Amino acid sequence: EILYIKGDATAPIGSGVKVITHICNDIGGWGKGFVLALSKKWKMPEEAYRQWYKSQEEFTLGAVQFVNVENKLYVANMIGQHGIYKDSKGLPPIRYDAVRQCLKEVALFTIAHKASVHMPRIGCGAGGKWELMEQIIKEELITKEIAVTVYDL
Numbered sequence: 001e002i003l004y005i006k007g008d009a010t011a012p013i014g015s016g017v018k019v020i021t022h023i024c025n026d027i028g029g030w031g032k033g034f035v036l037a038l039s040k041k042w043k044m045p046e047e048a049y050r051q052w053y054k055s056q057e058e059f060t061l062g063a064v065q066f067v068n069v070e071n072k073l074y075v076a077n078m079i080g081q082h083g084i085y086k087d088s089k090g091l092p093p094i095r096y097d098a099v100r101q102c103l104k105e106v107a108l109f110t111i112a113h114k115a116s117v118h119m120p121r122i123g124c125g126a127g128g129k130w131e132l133m134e135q136i137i138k139e140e141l142i143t144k145e146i147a148v149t150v151y152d153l
Contacts, residue, residue: 009151062101092127
């Protein structure tokens, strides 16, 4: 099961390799919420994301970028958000099929690195809803028996 702790995802607990996963948008925006907490500690994730956005090389929904910010520690930039607005049909920016691909890709990364997953309430804000998101995490990570720890407050 998924462990819910009250704390900070940029200061994950436990030992072993760890991967911090969070949802980025496909617009190139970086200045609100969890992203700032990441920039509070490391300049790399923000820089990697921007450079990936400017090159437009496979920068697309469902894709995942990995950044080694510290010893046995990786940040996972997951593009599971479309824009930040709400299209002309009342569709929240969150893309559940994209987060699924993203996590599906995180799954294999964690197994290959014997890592552990640590995230904040990704999706919530955005349009996301934990009821659905929780199921995704379940089917894509807990199912392959990957450790998952959510950080809220």
